[model samples]
Target: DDDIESRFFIINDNNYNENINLIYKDIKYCGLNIQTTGLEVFDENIRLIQIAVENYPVIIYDMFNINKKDILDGLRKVLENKNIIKIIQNGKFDAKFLLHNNFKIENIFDTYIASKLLDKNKNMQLFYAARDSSCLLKLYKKLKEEIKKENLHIVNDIENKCILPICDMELNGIKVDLENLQKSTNEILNELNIEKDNLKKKLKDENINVNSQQQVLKALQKNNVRDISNKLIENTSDSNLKNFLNHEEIISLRNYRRLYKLYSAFYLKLPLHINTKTNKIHTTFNQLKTFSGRFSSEKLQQIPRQKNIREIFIPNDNNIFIIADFKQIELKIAAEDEIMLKAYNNNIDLHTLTASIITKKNIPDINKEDRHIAKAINFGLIYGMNYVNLKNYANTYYGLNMSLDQCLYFYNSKGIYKWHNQVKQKRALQYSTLSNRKVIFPYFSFTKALNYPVQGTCADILKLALVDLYDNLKDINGKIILCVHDEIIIEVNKKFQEEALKILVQSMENSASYFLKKVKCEVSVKIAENWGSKD
Candidate 1:
């Protein structure tokens, strides 16, 4: 409770209780003596104190109708005695949670602080410390036996397990058919060089130097090339050159496109060697991973995008299909939250709004490039991207320039700015006021919150679906080759093609709802000559 007066009781050096001393001159006071009006418990260590409190803190009068109010009342009644209830350690979390939930707590006396001041680690877990400190094994065994007798129920022994397999499939540094990847890489490189040549000629035709930065900068600076904002560059800085030439995006996209082609050809050349007997690609999930307890898939992290990239996974027989993605699962989850609702005023589809604002109209017949930009801005803002960067990107890649105010206006217009501010405020408050359950740091609050309920739930559903799929498709001789984030690629015999595809789609859609409402999983079924697509 916020009203509670918290204190940390420090048990000090040997002192003489002169007021009540009858015989002894000095007493070595090492242990705590908690004698409260409602609850009386004593302990030398704080861990035991916590254990004692947990066991006897509240007695439910009406077990059937247990609620927050009942719990708070029970705690308040027990902690009412001013001179009673001495805690050995500063239980900040307990205090915070109680106060936040509307309960009254008065004073915390901490012995752990005294232990630290005395250069002692006395506040360690009692059971583990006792065992480590060489407590008599026989006595420990007997105490354990007593505990077992008191606790009749079996302890939960099931280790936390994930449904996905451990990824042992390394890229294996295959004999990269360097001839193939290099060929594609070279082809793209040549094509880009040719485009660069053409652009250079266009600039020369316009009485400008496209190849020389100095020449271009001079021309732009001489003309005082006004950006869409009418901002003039007097001289050539990297930023100015970047503005004049728009080199960064062109170079970055060209590089990415090159790597994309290279990897596509490289992976394509490799064979999808599923175990003939099992007919399944073993996908691996890494644990000890995220603080949120999510697992990462190593093999299925990146799925092929372009036709060349899609060529790698060879289907076992003839008929094959790849069920693709669940659209905007995270955003859908955000729409469920009250804060998001407040921000949007119940009008969902922030992406469409974002598109409209950026495009200055309803989502147009958005080309791949348009959708890509919209997605980048939408996702980037979650990680706190400012307008300057977005504007730079828009200017360079999409040939659009928006001022900082204009970009911020767009964000503010969407109301996500307000939502993000609220999240930051809440997080700061959690830190300042000692609360029992602290708010987790938000790398991207909206996305984090969105994924917590959506992606996490979807992960669970996918695991369940995979299990079911395995059970149902065990007899089938076809192979499940690849499973990326949301998509799965299967290579099956011609005979079982129709049945396998049906089961795959059904399982995915059935399991998808565990994470989202009114969800759709887009599927693409294709029969290709090899794992690599000809498209």
Candidate 2:
């Protein structure tokens, strides 16, 4: 059975009708693969489309000279058929491109997502042409059997529903103000160039490149600086680098490197991705990238949260962007544990409250700096931060001289250590999430065991909310554009902004109930013409 090879059939406009009839009549389920020129969903042309059915030759649609209308329409009919199951490897890309071209796909099963559930450690990469289609079909059947054995039907269902909405979001994409972006990039680069020139003049090295390690080191040495090498300078932390900044050369070099990196890494690449067709930059969302089941994307997600950079992302055609973010979502979820429930229920600001308890000061009297230290320690508990590391972090970030004994005493009084100990004991063997997904931690650490349930459950809740929100907004002029951690962004007509905000809040709150049974999760909403500015 393993040696049996599925045959391949190449079809174009000449044989497309016959192939369509055969596929419609005989194939109830098939694996699909689309070959495109680029990674973008809408801008790329479909070079080839392959579909593989069980025990039949793989059908290939060559888009070179074929009538695209005829093939797309026939494929649309097959995809719309209720009884047919469309299997795709990394289906999100194919689904988005198809939907962009006016093809609505239904009843899809993504082998990429299923493969993650099947074995988290396995690499799920596929190759080209019939070989890729053949591999996808085999992987689908094998994963189907494994999912049945493990009774992970819910995982399959959640993943299936997630693909289309996410595809739609990626296809709709986000509008960028290219003029603003270019202006900001030039301003930033000009400042960096000035600093570079200043550094070269000071060192009397006209040929110096600040970004070059050898040049920088040579320039610094020419200025009589000592005990510093390129490696030490590069590896030094922000707090430790303050001492070196007393030298003007070091200051200019640091500023030059920072600005140059920002210019080269992000600004230079963003313009290239803008589609000539829509004049908007589209990003690909990877559903199976993170271990925690959260979403990640190629470009937009990694953009630095700076005003100039963020302002470049604005609503199109005077539409408003409504952002709904869960307030302290992880902390809220972590409070469901018995140890933290009392403080959470009493309406205490957990960070300020912890600071008060540690410093013996009233909550209102706690200094902002002290509160920040307490906040770091509070969140660090989930990651199993030891007393020494906490003490060092406090010293490095806030210039505080907190003792290790203080950290130990704080954790003990708040039951943080006891909570983590209990979690490790219970979850080290195995754990089940609020979403009914099971995880095993055979070689577990306290940090992973304690964090997985709360963090993983939060991921599940956000995804559930996304599916519900997308379903409700399907017919409206509104669309969900971006999902960053616990926040969701939607771009809608100015008239429907309030309605869209309400739906976003309701969907998130309802989904939170699945994990936070007794407590309420609060969402804060902001509407603005541009990102990072609240109106």
Candidate 3:
């Protein structure tokens, strides 16, 4: 960290033009920012426009004292300058503010992100944009060299390309049908109340509160399932309750809980999340979302299965929605095994092949019901489920009674255990996708290690696909509106619908091919006005 004396220049009414014009000459890169009065850009005001140049005084346009248009007019020329690189810490915060003024910053170096990779070990630091723009040039130089050493440009380039599209998604938020959303939540709440009332009626007591666990337990003890223990009831999750309580009471209770969850989580709350500026539901897509390098879009990822909740989110006017979802992507990524490779190459149904292998039946004789059992087995093995859990999962989730020996044989013969042992034996704990996007686990576990290559590779494939699709969508008058897990939804102009589908198919399948060659990566495209369809 070289100590350079920081200089500041205050821009007021008289001297604004002269100082703002000085930044345009001979500068290759500069630190630029908009200092806001509050964090929320929608309702908040921009107080200062800060710019820093190496060996020159940092310009702080006192927006309160200056003509806003004159200040913006100056900043626009500098921002639109093609040659100069812009540097900022947490660039999106500034970019979003500037975008409000129809200003776009191109060729950025985000030092906040660089700190995470190279030197930003501490927690995210406090707000300091007005004077702190001076330090970005030094941070940029420092991070650039370290990034080169680590061959991080591969990931960084991909990340940099994704930023604008992500920003675009947040800006062009999904149009919300508020009345329908309220109706949907009302429907869920009605079901929740009915289940509660019926449950109370069943127990012959209006005093019974279905939500209270202790109250539910008191009723359960009086008319409990045979051999159900006190310990099991007290120490279990909401989902795990289904394993022990074997009757209509639990069915009602689970239904009530699920309905209540559906109402509270999204139906009742999502409208509140609508961006005031756009009048559309805007959610954040975190790129470095998890340790596995996937994306998390707030509560958007886990929408309630109450069915019609998704109908509220509609595409823009004159645009149709397109959902391109990957099919069996993880299993395809797990094609390090010969049998899996053979089945996929031969265009065989993987579940049916697995059904025959476990059932000892001919492939032709493996019926739909039989395949359902094998489907459970296939997923269990793929997820590294132990024999006991596998048996429990099959019997509990699907009504298939599987033996421990059968589970073991399927796991071993399927080549899943082979992958895990090799992973367990290996020590330098970082994995790379085909795109050279690498993630090092914070803590090691056999499950995560086995899962990382499959999920992480899919994440890279999706990102690459998103990048290509974003490029093509712009030309075809389309915009990527949302990214659910394993799915990218685009809003395209009707005229280019055919072009958008062709491009979407090619972009996704081709991107997947980069990772999986023999496994036959596939994508399915859907046309819908909303997120889901009843038919």
List candidate 2 segments past 4 Å from native.
Answer: 2-78, 81-87, 121-151, 200-238, 244-253, 269-274, 394-415, 423-432, 436-442
Per-model TM-score versus the true fold: 0.45, 0.78, 0.84
User: Clashes per prediction?
Assistant: 17, 0, 1
Please name the candidate that would achieve the greatest TM-score relative to the true structure.
3
Clashing pairs in 3: 115-120
lDDT of 3 by residue, 347-366 (tens): 77789988888778998999
Report the lDDT tens digits of candidate 2 across residue range 403-522.
788878866654665776677666555765666566666676677667777767677778878877877786675787888888888899999888988888887887787568766778
For model 1, what is the alpha-carbon lDDT of residue 165?
14
- CA lDDT, every prediction? 0.41, 0.73, 0.72
Query: Which wins on TM-score, candidate 2 or candidate 3?
Result: 3
CA-RMSD of model 2 = 5.4
| Global CA lDDT computed for model 1 | 0.41
lDDT order, best first, reads 2, 3, 1
lDDT for residue 516 in candidate 1, whole number 0-100: 45
